Structures are given as structure tokens and as C-alpha cells.
Amino acid sequence: ETKFVQALFDFNPQESGELAFKRGDVITLINKDDPNWWEGQLNNRRGIFPSNYVAPYNSN
């Protein structure tokens, strides 16, 4: 499963652990270890972030 989410805001994490995504950026959800903080993969990069800052596109 693939899960794709669309961010609604840019996220510039300077630190490690947080994924770097932008607005409307289709991120491939890696996991949901945290109901608030979801992990996602942006092409290749992994990272965690408040899913609140996005919206499942999943594409379907």
C-alpha cells in the first residue's frame, strides 16, 4: 500500500527525522507510527511530519 498524501504547507525541516515536503506535494506515506506525525517518502526521501499539514490524495 501505497499511500499518498498531499501537503498543504511547506515544511523545511532543518533537522533529521522530519521529511522535507512542500505544498501540495504528493508524499508517499511510509507509516503512521504517530496519529499526528506520519512518515512519508518524497521520491526518495523519508521523513516524519504532522499529517495535519497534509491531505491524503491517494490518488486514488
Coordinates of all heavy atoms in Angstrom, one line a residue:
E1 N 0.6 -1.0 0.0 CA 0.0 0.0 0.0 C 0.7 1.1 0.0 O 1.4 1.4 0.9 CB -0.8 0.1 1.2 CG -2.1 -0.6 1.0 CD -2.1 -1.9 1.9 OE1 -2.2 -1.7 3.1 OE2 -1.9 -3.0 1.4
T2 N 0.3 1.6 -0.9 CA 0.7 2.8 -1.1 C -0.4 3.8 -0.7 O -1.6 3.7 -1.0 CB 1.2 2.8 -2.4 OG1 2.2 3.7 -2.6 CG2 0.0 2.9 -3.4
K3 N 0.2 4.8 -0.1 CA -0.5 5.9 0.3 C 0.1 7.1 0.0 O 1.3 7.3 0.3 CB -0.5 5.8 1.7 CG -1.6 5.1 2.0 CD -1.8 4.9 3.4 CE -3.1 4.3 3.2 NZ -3.9 4.1 4.3
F4 N -0.6 8.0 -0.6 CA -0.1 9.2 -1.0 C -0.9 10.3 -0.3 O -2.1 10.3 -0.3 CB -0.2 9.4 -2.5 CG 0.7 8.4 -3.1 CD1 0.1 7.1 -3.5 CD2 2.0 8.7 -3.3 CE1 0.9 6.2 -4.1 CE2 2.8 7.7 -3.9 CZ 2.3 6.5 -4.3
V5 N -0.2 11.3 0.1 CA -0.8 12.4 0.8 C -0.3 13.7 0.1 O 0.7 13.8 -0.4 CB -0.5 12.5 2.3 CG1 -1.2 11.4 3.0 CG2 1.0 12.4 2.5
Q6 N -1.2 14.7 0.2 CA -0.9 16.0 -0.3 C -0.7 17.1 0.7 O -1.7 17.4 1.4 CB -1.9 16.4 -1.3 CG -1.4 17.2 -2.4 CD -2.6 18.0 -3.0 OE1 -3.6 18.1 -2.3 NE2 -2.4 18.6 -4.2
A7 N 0.4 17.6 0.8 CA 0.7 18.6 1.8 C 0.0 19.9 1.5 O -0.4 20.2 0.4 CB 2.2 18.9 1.9
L8 N -0.3 20.7 2.5 CA -1.0 22.0 2.4 C -0.1 23.1 2.8 O -0.5 24.3 2.9 CB -2.3 22.0 3.2 CG -2.1 21.4 4.6 CD1 -2.6 22.4 5.6 CD2 -3.0 20.1 4.7
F9 N 1.1 22.8 3.1 CA 2.1 23.7 3.6 C 3.5 23.3 3.3 O 3.7 22.1 3.4 CB 1.8 23.9 5.0 CG 1.8 25.3 5.4 CD1 1.5 26.3 4.5 CD2 2.1 25.6 6.7 CE1 1.4 27.7 4.9 CE2 2.1 26.9 7.1 CZ 1.8 27.9 6.2
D10 N 4.4 24.2 3.2 CA 5.7 23.9 3.0 C 6.4 23.5 4.3 O 6.1 24.2 5.4 CB 6.5 25.0 2.4 CG 5.9 25.4 1.0 OD1 5.7 24.5 0.2 OD2 5.7 26.5 0.7
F11 N 7.3 22.6 4.3 CA 7.9 22.1 5.5 C 9.4 22.0 5.3 O 9.9 21.1 4.5 CB 7.4 20.8 6.0 CG 7.7 20.6 7.4 CD1 7.1 21.5 8.4 CD2 8.5 19.5 7.8 CE1 7.4 21.3 9.7 CE2 8.7 19.3 9.2 CZ 8.2 20.2 10.1
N12 N 10.2 22.8 5.9 CA 11.6 22.9 5.8 C 12.2 22.4 7.1 O 12.7 23.2 7.9 CB 12.0 24.3 5.7 CG 12.9 24.5 4.5 OD1 13.9 23.8 4.3 ND2 12.4 25.4 3.7
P13 N 12.3 21.1 7.3 CA 13.0 20.6 8.4 C 14.5 20.6 8.3 O 15.1 20.0 7.4 CB 12.5 19.2 8.5 CG 12.3 18.8 7.0 CD 11.9 20.1 6.4
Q14 N 15.1 21.3 9.1 CA 16.5 21.5 9.2 C 17.2 20.4 9.9 O 18.4 20.3 10.0 CB 16.5 22.5 10.4 CG 17.8 23.5 10.4 CD 17.6 25.0 10.0 OE1 17.8 25.9 10.9 NE2 17.1 25.3 8.8
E15 N 16.4 19.6 10.6 CA 16.9 18.5 11.4 C 16.6 17.2 10.8 O 15.9 17.2 9.8 CB 16.3 18.7 12.8 CG 16.4 20.0 13.4 CD 16.3 20.0 14.9 OE1 16.2 18.9 15.5 OE2 16.3 21.1 15.6
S16 N 17.1 16.2 11.4 CA 16.9 14.9 10.8 C 15.7 14.2 11.4 O 15.3 14.5 12.6 CB 18.1 13.9 11.0 OG 19.1 14.5 11.8
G17 N 15.0 13.4 10.7 CA 13.8 12.7 11.1 C 12.6 13.2 10.5 O 11.7 12.5 10.2
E18 N 12.6 14.5 10.2 CA 11.5 15.1 9.5 C 11.7 15.2 8.0 O 12.7 15.5 7.5 CB 11.2 16.5 10.0 CG 11.0 16.6 11.5 CD 11.2 17.9 12.1 OE1 12.3 18.2 12.5 OE2 10.3 18.7 12.2
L19 N 10.6 14.8 7.3 CA 10.7 14.8 5.9 C 10.5 16.2 5.3 O 9.8 17.0 5.9 CB 9.7 13.8 5.3 CG 8.8 14.4 4.2 CD1 9.5 14.4 2.9 CD2 7.5 13.6 4.1
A20 N 11.2 16.5 4.2 CA 11.1 17.8 3.6 C 10.1 17.7 2.5 O 10.3 17.1 1.4 CB 12.5 18.2 3.1
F21 N 9.0 18.4 2.7 CA 8.0 18.5 1.6 C 7.4 19.9 1.5 O 7.7 20.8 2.2 CB 6.8 17.6 2.1 CG 6.3 17.9 3.4 CD1 5.1 18.6 3.6 CD2 7.0 17.5 4.6 CE1 4.6 18.9 4.8 CE2 6.5 17.8 5.9 CZ 5.3 18.5 6.0
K22 N 6.7 20.1 0.4 CA 6.2 21.3 0.2 C 4.7 21.3 0.0 O 4.0 20.4 0.4 CB 6.6 21.7 -1.1 CG 8.0 21.4 -1.5 CD 7.5 22.0 -2.8 CE 8.4 22.2 -4.0 NZ 9.4 23.3 -3.7
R23 N 4.1 22.4 -0.5 CA 2.7 22.5 -0.6 C 2.2 21.6 -1.7 O 2.8 21.6 -2.8 CB 2.4 23.9 -0.8 CG 1.6 24.3 0.4 CD 1.5 25.7 0.1 NE 0.4 26.3 0.7 CZ -0.1 27.2 0.1 NH1 0.4 27.3 -1.2 NH2 -1.3 27.9 0.5
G24 N 1.1 21.0 -1.5 CA 0.5 20.1 -2.5 C 1.4 19.0 -3.0 O 1.3 18.5 -4.0
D25 N 2.5 18.8 -2.2 CA 3.5 17.8 -2.5 C 3.0 16.4 -2.2 O 2.7 16.1 -1.0 CB 4.7 18.2 -1.8 CG 5.7 17.1 -1.6 OD1 5.5 16.0 -2.2 OD2 6.7 17.3 -0.9
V26 N 2.8 15.5 -3.2 CA 2.4 14.2 -3.0 C 3.4 13.3 -2.3 O 4.4 12.9 -3.0 CB 2.0 13.5 -4.4 CG1 1.4 12.1 -4.1 CG2 1.1 14.4 -5.1
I27 N 3.3 13.1 -1.1 CA 4.2 12.3 -0.3 C 3.7 10.9 -0.1 O 2.5 10.7 0.2 CB 4.4 13.0 1.1 CG1 4.8 14.4 0.9 CG2 5.6 12.2 1.8 CD1 4.4 15.3 2.1
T28 N 4.6 10.0 -0.3 CA 4.2 8.6 -0.1 C 4.4 8.2 1.3 O 5.5 7.9 1.8 CB 5.1 7.7 -1.0 OG1 5.3 8.3 -2.3 CG2 4.6 6.3 -1.2
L29 N 3.2 8.1 2.0 CA 3.2 7.7 3.4 C 4.0 6.4 3.6 O 3.8 5.4 3.0 CB 1.8 7.5 3.8 CG 1.6 7.3 5.3 CD1 1.9 8.6 6.0 CD2 0.2 6.8 5.6
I30 N 5.0 6.5 4.5 CA 5.8 5.4 4.9 C 5.2 4.6 6.0 O 5.1 3.4 6.0 CB 7.2 5.9 5.3 CG1 7.8 6.8 4.2 CG2 8.1 4.7 5.5 CD1 8.9 7.6 4.7
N31 N 4.7 5.4 7.0 CA 4.0 4.8 8.1 C 3.3 5.8 8.9 O 3.5 7.0 8.7 CB 4.8 3.8 9.0 CG 6.3 4.1 9.3 OD1 7.0 3.2 9.8 ND2 6.9 5.3 8.9
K32 N 2.5 5.3 9.8 CA 1.7 6.2 10.7 C 2.0 5.8 12.2 O 1.0 5.6 12.9 CB 0.3 6.0 10.4 CG -0.2 6.9 9.3 CD -1.6 6.6 9.0 CE -1.8 5.3 8.3 NZ -3.1 5.2 7.7
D33 N 3.2 5.7 12.5 CA 3.6 5.4 13.8 C 2.9 6.4 14.8 O 2.8 6.0 16.0 CB 5.1 5.7 13.9 CG 6.0 4.5 14.3 OD1 6.2 4.2 15.5 OD2 6.4 3.7 13.4
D34 N 2.6 7.5 14.4 CA 2.1 8.6 15.2 C 0.8 9.1 14.6 O 0.9 9.7 13.5 CB 3.1 9.6 15.4 CG 2.8 10.5 16.6 OD1 2.9 10.0 17.8 OD2 2.4 11.7 16.5
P35 N -0.3 9.0 15.3 CA -1.6 9.5 14.7 C -1.5 11.0 14.2 O -2.2 11.4 13.4 CB -2.5 9.5 15.9 CG -1.8 8.8 17.1 CD -0.4 8.4 16.6
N36 N -0.5 11.7 14.7 CA -0.3 13.1 14.3 C 0.8 13.2 13.4 O 0.8 13.9 12.4 CB -0.1 14.0 15.5 CG -1.4 14.4 16.2 OD1 -1.7 14.0 17.3 ND2 -2.1 15.3 15.4
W37 N 1.9 12.5 13.7 CA 3.1 12.5 12.9 C 3.2 11.3 12.0 O 3.4 10.2 12.4 CB 4.3 12.6 13.8 CG 4.6 14.0 14.2 CD1 3.9 14.7 15.1 CD2 5.7 14.8 13.8 NE1 4.4 16.0 15.3 CE2 5.5 16.0 14.5 CE3 6.7 14.6 12.9 CZ2 6.4 17.1 14.3 CZ3 7.6 15.7 12.7 CH2 7.5 16.9 13.4
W38 N 3.0 11.6 10.7 CA 3.1 10.5 9.7 C 4.4 10.6 8.9 O 4.8 11.6 8.6 CB 1.9 10.6 8.8 CG 0.6 10.3 9.4 CD1 0.4 10.0 10.7 CD2 -0.7 10.2 8.8 NE1 -0.9 9.7 11.0 CE2 -1.6 9.9 9.8 CE3 -1.1 10.4 7.5 CZ2 -2.9 9.7 9.5 CZ3 -2.4 10.2 7.2 CH2 -3.3 9.9 8.2
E39 N 4.9 9.4 8.6 CA 6.1 9.3 7.9 C 5.8 9.3 6.4 O 4.8 8.6 6.0 CB 6.9 8.1 8.3 CG 8.4 8.2 7.8 CD 9.3 8.1 9.0 OE1 9.0 7.6 10.1 OE2 10.5 8.5 8.8
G40 N 6.6 9.9 5.6 CA 6.3 9.9 4.2 C 7.6 9.9 3.4 O 8.6 10.4 3.8
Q41 N 7.5 9.5 2.1 CA 8.6 9.5 1.3 C 8.4 10.3 0.1 O 7.4 10.1 -0.7 CB 8.9 8.1 0.8 CG 10.3 7.8 0.5 CD 10.5 6.5 -0.2 OE1 9.7 5.7 -0.1 NE2 11.6 6.4 -1.0
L42 N 9.2 11.3 -0.1 CA 9.1 12.2 -1.2 C 10.1 11.8 -2.3 O 11.2 12.4 -2.3 CB 9.4 13.6 -0.7 CG 8.2 14.5 -0.9 CD1 8.7 15.9 -1.2 CD2 7.3 14.1 -2.1
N43 N 9.7 10.9 -3.1 CA 10.5 10.4 -4.2 C 11.6 9.5 -3.7 O 12.0 8.6 -4.5 CB 11.2 11.6 -4.8 CG 11.1 11.5 -6.2 OD1 11.4 10.4 -6.7 ND2 10.5 12.5 -6.9
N44 N 12.1 9.8 -2.6 CA 13.3 9.1 -2.1 C 13.6 9.4 -0.7 O 14.3 8.6 0.0 CB 14.4 9.5 -2.9 CG 15.0 8.5 -3.8 OD1 14.3 7.5 -4.1 ND2 16.2 8.7 -4.2
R45 N 13.2 10.5 -0.3 CA 13.5 10.9 1.0 C 12.4 10.6 1.9 O 11.2 10.7 1.6 CB 13.6 12.4 1.0 CG 12.7 13.1 0.1 CD 13.0 14.5 0.3 NE 13.5 15.0 -0.8 CZ 14.8 15.4 -0.8 NH1 15.8 14.7 0.0 NH2 15.0 16.4 -1.6
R46 N 12.8 10.1 3.0 CA 11.9 9.8 4.1 C 11.9 10.8 5.1 O 12.9 11.5 5.3 CB 12.3 8.4 4.6 CG 11.7 7.3 3.9 CD 12.8 6.8 3.3 NE 12.7 5.6 2.7 CZ 13.8 4.9 2.4 NH1 14.9 5.6 2.8 NH2 13.8 3.8 1.6
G47 N 10.9 10.8 5.9 CA 10.8 11.7 7.0 C 9.4 11.7 7.6 O 8.5 11.3 7.0
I48 N 9.4 12.2 8.8 CA 8.1 12.3 9.6 C 7.7 13.7 9.7 O 8.5 14.6 9.6 CB 8.3 11.7 11.0 CG1 9.5 12.4 11.7 CG2 8.5 10.2 10.9 CD1 9.2 12.7 13.1
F49 N 6.4 13.9 9.8 CA 5.8 15.2 9.9 C 4.3 15.1 10.3 O 3.7 14.1 10.1 CB 5.9 15.9 8.5 CG 5.1 15.3 7.5 CD1 4.1 16.0 6.9 CD2 5.4 14.0 7.1 CE1 3.3 15.4 5.9 CE2 4.7 13.4 6.1 CZ 3.6 14.1 5.5
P50 N 3.8 16.2 10.8 CA 2.4 16.2 11.2 C 1.5 16.1 10.0 O 1.4 17.0 9.2 CB 2.2 17.6 11.8 CG 3.6 18.1 12.1 CD 4.5 17.4 11.1
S51 N 0.9 14.9 9.9 CA 0.0 14.7 8.8 C -1.1 15.8 8.7 O -1.6 16.1 7.6 CB -0.7 13.4 8.9 OG -1.1 13.1 10.3
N52 N -1.2 16.5 9.8 CA -2.2 17.6 9.8 C -1.9 18.6 8.8 O -2.7 19.5 8.4 CB -2.1 18.2 11.1 CG -3.4 18.2 11.8 OD1 -4.4 17.8 11.3 ND2 -3.5 18.8 13.0
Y53 N -0.6 18.6 8.3 CA -0.1 19.6 7.4 C -0.3 19.0 6.0 O 0.4 19.5 5.1 CB 1.3 19.9 7.7 CG 1.5 21.2 8.3 CD1 2.3 21.4 9.4 CD2 0.9 22.3 7.8 CE1 2.5 22.7 10.0 CE2 1.1 23.6 8.3 CZ 1.9 23.8 9.4 OH 2.1 25.0 10.0
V54 N -1.1 18.0 5.8 CA -1.3 17.4 4.5 C -2.7 16.9 4.3 O -3.6 17.2 5.1 CB -0.3 16.3 4.3 CG1 1.0 16.7 4.7 CG2 -0.8 15.0 5.0
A55 N -3.0 16.2 3.3 CA -4.3 15.6 3.0 C -4.1 14.5 2.0 O -3.7 14.7 0.9 CB -5.1 16.7 2.4
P56 N -4.5 13.3 2.5 CA -4.4 12.1 1.7 C -5.0 12.3 0.3 O -6.2 12.7 0.2 CB -5.3 11.1 2.5 CG -5.1 11.5 3.9 CD -5.0 13.0 3.9
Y57 N -4.3 12.1 -0.7 CA -4.7 12.3 -2.0 C -5.0 10.9 -2.4 O -6.2 10.6 -2.7 CB -3.6 12.9 -2.9 CG -3.9 13.1 -4.3 CD1 -5.3 12.8 -4.7 CD2 -3.0 13.5 -5.2 CE1 -5.6 13.1 -6.1 CE2 -3.3 13.7 -6.5 CZ -4.6 13.5 -7.0 OH -4.9 13.7 -8.3
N58 N -4.0 10.1 -2.3 CA -4.2 8.8 -2.6 C -5.0 8.8 -3.6 O -6.0 8.2 -3.8 CB -4.9 7.8 -1.8 CG -5.3 6.6 -2.9 OD1 -6.5 6.5 -3.1 ND2 -4.4 6.0 -3.7
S59 N -4.3 9.4 -4.4 CA -4.7 9.3 -5.6 C -5.3 8.1 -5.5 O -4.7 7.1 -5.8 CB -3.5 8.9 -6.2 OG -3.2 9.9 -7.2
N60 N -6.5 8.1 -5.3 CA -6.7 7.0 -5.7 C -6.4 7.6 -7.2 O -6.8 8.7 -7.5 CB -8.1 6.5 -5.4 CG -8.1 5.8 -6.8 OD1 -7.3 4.9 -7.1 ND2 -8.9 6.6 -7.5

